[PDB]
Amino acid sequence: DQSSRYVNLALKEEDLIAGGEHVLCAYIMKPKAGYGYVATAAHFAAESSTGTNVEVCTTDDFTRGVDALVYEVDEARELTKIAYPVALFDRNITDGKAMIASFLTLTMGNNQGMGDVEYAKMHDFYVPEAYRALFDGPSVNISALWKVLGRPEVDGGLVVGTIIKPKLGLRPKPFAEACHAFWLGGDFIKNDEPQGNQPFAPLRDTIALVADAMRRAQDETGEAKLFSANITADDPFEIIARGEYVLETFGENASHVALLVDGYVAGAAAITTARRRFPDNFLHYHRAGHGAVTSPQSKRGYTAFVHCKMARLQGASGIHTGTMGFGKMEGESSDRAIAYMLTQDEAQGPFYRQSWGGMKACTPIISGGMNALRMPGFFENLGNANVILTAGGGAFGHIDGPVAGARSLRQAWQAWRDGVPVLDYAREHKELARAFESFPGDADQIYPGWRKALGVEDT
Amino acid sequence: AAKDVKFGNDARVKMLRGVNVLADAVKVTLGPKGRNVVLDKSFGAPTITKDGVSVAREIELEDKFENMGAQMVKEVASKANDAAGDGTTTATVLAQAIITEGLKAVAAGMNPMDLKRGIDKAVTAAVEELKALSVPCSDSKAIAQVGTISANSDETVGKLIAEAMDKVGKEGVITVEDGTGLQDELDVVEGMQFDRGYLSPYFINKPETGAVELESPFILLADKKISNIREMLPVLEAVAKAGKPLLIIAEDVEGEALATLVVNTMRGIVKVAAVKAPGFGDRRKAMLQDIATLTGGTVISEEIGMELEKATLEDLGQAKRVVINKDTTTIIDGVGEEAAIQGRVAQIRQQIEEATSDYDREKLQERVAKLAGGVAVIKVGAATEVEMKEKKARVEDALHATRAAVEEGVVAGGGVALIRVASKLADLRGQNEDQNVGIKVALRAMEAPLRQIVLNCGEEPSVVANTVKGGDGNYGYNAATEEYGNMIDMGILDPTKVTRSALQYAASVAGLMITTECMVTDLP
Amino acid sequence: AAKDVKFGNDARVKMLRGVNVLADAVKVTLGPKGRNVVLDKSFGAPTITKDGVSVAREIELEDKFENMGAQMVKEVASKANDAAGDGTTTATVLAQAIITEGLKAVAAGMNPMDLKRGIDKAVTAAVEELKALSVPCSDSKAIAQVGTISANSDETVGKLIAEAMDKVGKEGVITVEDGTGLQDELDVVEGMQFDRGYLSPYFINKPETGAVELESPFILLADKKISNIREMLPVLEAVAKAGKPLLIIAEDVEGEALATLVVNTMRGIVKVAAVKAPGFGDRRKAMLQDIATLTGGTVISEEIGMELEKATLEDLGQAKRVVINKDTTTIIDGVGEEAAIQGRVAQIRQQIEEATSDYDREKLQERVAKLAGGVAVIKVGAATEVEMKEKKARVEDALHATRAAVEEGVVAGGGVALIRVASKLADLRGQNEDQNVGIKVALRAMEAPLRQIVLNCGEEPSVVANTVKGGDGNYGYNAATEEYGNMIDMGILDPTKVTRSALQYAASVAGLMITTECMVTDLP
Amino acid sequence: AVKAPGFGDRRKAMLQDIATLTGGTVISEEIGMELEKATLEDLGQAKRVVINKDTTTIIDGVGEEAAIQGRVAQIRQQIEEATSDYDREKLQ
After folding, report:
1. Segments making up each domain of chain C, as ranges
2. Is any Cβ of chain A less than 8 angstroms from the Cβ of C139?
3. Can you tell me the distance from the alpha carbon of A306 to that of C497, in angstroms, rounded to the nearest whole number?
4. A136-438 has which fold?
């Protein structure tokens, strides 16, 4: 019985790297100062995991790891490294797959309710390069789908677009096509995401799919359809008959033709038919963030970034991680340690670096303000994620101007093939400091960009 | 899509209602008896203030017509906020007078354009009369008095600001502080001030707190990291033979440079102060010339066409005293000629003309204020956050009032001059009868400030208005004493810039709003 | 949701019940006849407590207007948390007094400007009279008395705290600890204690358990880290001939360093111990500089011209004794000259006089106490977590009282001195009738706390009020004995300045609430 | 010194228009010529030019009518355009 005495891992991540077949899935048991001991384990896995009519077992039988087999290392700061093992589960001759109820009981840690979300920033623990052994392995995005046409992997191009004024509405193709007829940055337009044939939808639900019948201007017109015309149907049982073998003229460009990724009803369900052929249905989410759960007034959401570690198949251009956590009350080892981790002058380390046996694009999102004039800022770790530098259009009120910069899905090509340090992320331009005239809600207390709005006669 | 149109008074009533609500919100807030209103905040605490325009920003009514009318009349409140902040009360009250008297007497029918032209030329005549009647202000005692008037009849901070004015002259600037001392305090820091401190604690020097206090410093300017420009030992030896220390404005520091400074300052004769760049690149390079002219030197940088490496004893500027803490830096005085200083001042004069509003203007004003004198540091006198904010709002209102009075002169308070000159030029004639009607409506509505002042005092507006009209010159009614009195003797004087701005803005907005014949709303 | 406007009494009416509800929550709780209220948390267990501010922190009702009145009145409770921590019940009864007086003032209609003038004048006069009535406190028995009354006459724990205060001195600072047993225990920690224990089980010195206890140790400052060069032998071997203990201070210890330390510990070369990096840069710099100065150590840094190879035998630090355990390393005392120690304490006091005046200064107070005092530990014998919370609230209130009395001293508690000074401040006069009315209204407002004190035990209000107001000196009423007597015999002595701060916050909040004109809220 | 930040084709067109106006010829890589095959007479000239911090002003040109009317003849068809709204406004 009990839970432990099965894994006595007593070494740091170095041992978790040497094994190679260690996959981590669990919740951090860091009891919040203020919340006392009993509730930390009461709401961990006792009532939020499975429901657990009596108890269940796998066909292999005698699995010792139903509970959290915690090898968590706790000597300095309670750095939590806990895994729900998957490699020790049922291993079969040809497929290696377990039964129906095996994964259903243990692997879906649910933080549905517990207060462990006030501030919890989780930086880097990732499945190493030894992942292709008995697993499929996703490492492809739109920067790697049409890669032969000019996109390399890491920050090397994309298909996600910036929109010139007007922001959205009065769809460009009839009259505002000149905004899209500028290959200089108008190249792939998307609309607001909370739309489609949802049960809670307005009268426009008919319009979305109707956008399919107006694809008549992609062949004889001289332009290729690159709008997110929201025609991805809900009911799939129609394509079955004809399109299978030859008539696949629509293409693999799930991020050129529209795709509905709202985060609740679609996910990555495409796994079934396309285990190996087309595992890349792009994470087609319109760029909306910092307005749903991050705000202390409106907190609607949850934390699942640890469990999203398998989701790299989508090619994420947006994930609702949260915020840096700036504001409220500071002091008592003030929360400005974001700067104090690297910007401190009298620090030193001679020996090791960031090498977790399988590095990939990993850089936190620029929130608030981070300009190239603050070159001693955010460019230390990697500086770029699977995104392209695109912020509010405060200084972007011109037709062509610096034509190179506005190339949202093209200047990344040059700015990563230029090969000039981590500055490539902000190699584009630096006048973004004026963009605060448009969007206030990113710099509110520390940066002096809000000083003009209010606060008595001072500048 | 959902649109509804209402025409004439059918719409007007609703608009009137909303405007009337605004009047109810506003009129009770001014006067010796009036009270200030509290602004709801979901995150934090509602804040008590006199700020009417903020209220209008946060006023909301369920009726679509009324709510949108409130937001569209909010524009004049915002524009009046742009200049002073008080006397916006006067613009609001004259707007209520306009709407009330006009809409109750004209009953539409007549031409809004002719009425607007008449009131516009009447406004022009009132502007002329106000310019003619403006009385200059000379004594700083009257300056303190008018600041107190702007300070809601509060004298201690007013005389504090007056003494600050005496110390710093016209060019001096002030600071705003949060939760510092809870009681009034005023000091002045003279000379140039830098938003940096010494990077290495190893620079503990003779003054306490480990500060760096050096007489006759020698300045060095650098926009690069110095490794081989370590070969300044001729200049370094010249400084050592001079007997006075030197200061470094290097942009970046080599590890060898930092180490050699640490070792040679600890035991030696050359104690040097080294600090990082003050701020952003643009303003830094702009104020490099300010430093050069202040110390009488020339800017030392590689990206200019003098020399990248060479340096002489005359290349560096000379100063009197530097006092530096771990966070803040100050240079008391530098050895610079007045000729080049005012030449830079002259080029800054053309620099003053700009339309960027924020950013460059604020830094240029700050750097020039330090170029001329010093900055006034203050500890606010108040117990709570709202009290501090109200005190600071009164302080800035007093500052604006002093500026406008010094540049323009003063007039008798209560708008009595306005109604007096309106009586003086009552014979104004227009193009047609409608224009004369507009002229007469405007002159009658100009009484609104005093009418509301009397009404708020719990006294009959008509009686006191008639008595004041009987009074002449600088004699009239003191509302604070609820008796008679001379405005000069009571010291209630108003700079006229705010009056002119408010009257122009309110006249324009009333003239545009009166011409309405249809109103459009969105339906739920 | 949508905005709702309420004018005058409409808001005022609402405001009433708001604080009334708060009063119903709070006023009855004080005193031995006072009880405790339950504040439950959905995830956790309910907390039943008597601390008024603890009640106030989570106060919220359904009504918008009552909620906003509550959030104004919660500001004084939050400020009490920040500064005092007790007398929160006094702040609440002050709020009840001021709301009653405000409604009465609105009933009569005095000018709020004059009202707040009278309020602040009376408050300042009360401050002056209290300062006149101040009584010094130095002996330990009065310390025990104030600790008991703060813990509601808890003689056992109060005497425990007084004894701890005596043995650790004034500079000794006490911490909060978890409860395991059924009885309290007191621990004193001297010198620098830090989370540093031996890495390898071979580091066991004579006192078993890997504990290294060295008298008069010899301490090496090995800046940063040393793995590859690995040869600290120029001093290591020299002290090995000296046959003396060795202490190493390095940020990181590698397999080679552990190997050679094991060699020294096992083969018997010489007794050597090492210590890891402390932590953040600021903390490590501070606690290494202070130790080196106190122990007479040598500032050693490869950041400065210095090496482990380029070292002097005089670099050793010296202490009295050091005790290292599995996780914690403790320096009991250091060997240093008196003049240098007092000079370093003087410079750290110069650090005390910091513009930060915040938790940085508290981490500095850690260092200051280790300079002079020590760490005090009261490990409570609490059985359950909620009783632990109540115990710790009591002891923290006692700590606040003791620390406040350290600087201020104590005066008669229970409001007897307060009603005495109010009776004195009964001769105050104002400028006009409004000011005099405001002063006398403040007189009843300060009478209110004492009469609610009387009614908390349900005693004769008029008899107590008359017999106390007529009386003077130490003659007063005790709730613990519920009878008259000498104040010194009753021994309810309180550092008044916390009450001073509370009453001036009360004055400020009364001044803001007397600005009640109109309110706009959101729909539920 | 003047730097042209604009879009390629339109920037080239406006520079060649400048050269024609001032009687000069563009030293451009659109021709196979460079500084090595270039003369001081190929430089543009004017009679009176005024430059400020923000803007530049050329008052007199040298292209007289030969360049101006030739460019007008080639631009008359350009006056009508398919970009329609305000592109023609910028052309005029």
Report:
1. 1-134+410-524, 135-190+372-409, 191-371
2. no
3. 52
4. TIM Barrel (3.20.20)
The two structure tokens encoding residue B481: 């004493």
Residue C484, burial from CB neighbour count under 10 angstroms (0-12, 13-18, 19+): middle
| Residue A110 to residues A314, B81, B121, Cα–Cα distance (Å) | 22, 52, 73
Q: Is D84 on the interface with A (CB under 8 A)?
A: no
Which residues from A are below 8 Å from D8, CB to CB?
Answer: 403
Number of Cβ within a 10 Å radius of residue C176: 13
Q: Are strands B518-522 and B3-7 parallel, antiparallel or unpaired?
A: antiparallel
Q: Which candidate, C126, C91, C102, C127, places its Cα nearest to that of C437?
A: C102
Are the Cβ atoms of B35 and C515 closer than 8 angstroms?
Answer: yes
Cβ–Cβ below 8 Å for B199 and A373:
no
Q: Is the distance from CB of B317 to CB of B335 less than 8 angstroms?
A: yes
- Selected residues 9-38 of chain A with any CB under 8 Å from a CB in chain C: 35-36
Fold of C191-371: GroEL (3.50.7)
Query: What's the rounded Cα separation, in Å, for the pair B150 and B142?
Result: 12
**Partner-chain contact A344 C281, CB within 8 Å:** yes
**Among A286, A307, A360, A430, which one carries the catalytic annotation?**
A286
Return the domain boundaries, chain A: 4-135, 136-438
Taking a C-beta distance cutoff of 8 angstroms, is the pair B459, B465 a contact?
no
Q: Which of C280, C284, C303 to mutate against chain A (most A CBs within 10 Å)?
A: C280
Question: What method did the depositors use to determine the structure?
Answer: cryo-EM
Q: Which residues of C touch B59 (CB under 8 A)?
A: 3, 520
Nearest to B45 among C3, C75, C304 (CB): C75
A165 labelled catalytic: yes
The Cβ of residue C90 has, within 10 Å, a number of other Cβ atoms equal to 25
Active site residue A32: no
Q: Identify the three-state secondary structure at position B99.
A: helix
Q: Which of C113, C303, C512 sits opposite B48 (nearest CB)?
A: C512
Specify the pairing of strand B329-334 against strand B192-194. Answer: antiparallel
Strands (E), C396-453: 411-412
Shortest distance, CA C49 to any CA of chain A (angstroms): 17
DSSP string computed for C2-55: -EEEEETHHHHHHHHHHHHHHHHHHGGGSSSS---EEE--SSS--EEE--HHHH
Q: Which of C225, C359, C385 sits opposite A332 (nearest CB)?
A: C359
Q: CATH says C135-190+372-409 is which class?
A: alpha beta
- Nearest Cα to B147, choosing from B139, B157, B137? B157
Token duo for residue C365: 């107070």
Put simply, whether C256 touches A (Cβ < 8 Å) is no
State how far the Cα of C291 lies from the Cα of C288, in Å rounded to an integer.
Answer: 5
Which CATH number applies to A4-135?
Answer: 3.30.70.150
Contacts of A22 (CB under 8 A, 6+ apart): A16, A83, A87
Cβ separation of A459 and B176 shorter than 8 Å?
Answer: no
> Rounded CA gap, C25 and B435, in Å?
66
What Rg, from alpha-carbon coordinates, does chain B have?
Answer: 30
Chains A and B touch (3+ CB pairs under 8 A): yes
Measured in angstroms, the CA of C68 and the nearest CA of chain B are apart by: 8
Pairing assessment for the beta strands B246-249 and B219-221 based on DSSP bridges: parallel
Are A297 and B43 a contacting pair at CB < 8 A? yes
Using CA atoms in the order B83, B89, B94, B98, what is the torsion angle rounded to 10 degrees?
100
Tell me the CATH number of domain C1-134+410-524, given options 1.10.472.10, 1.10.560.10, 1.20.210.10, 1.10.10.10. Answer: 1.10.560.10
> Which contiguous run of DSSP H or E holds residue C313?
none
Contacts (Cβ under 8 Å, ≥6 apart) of C55:
C25, C26, C29, C37, C39, C49
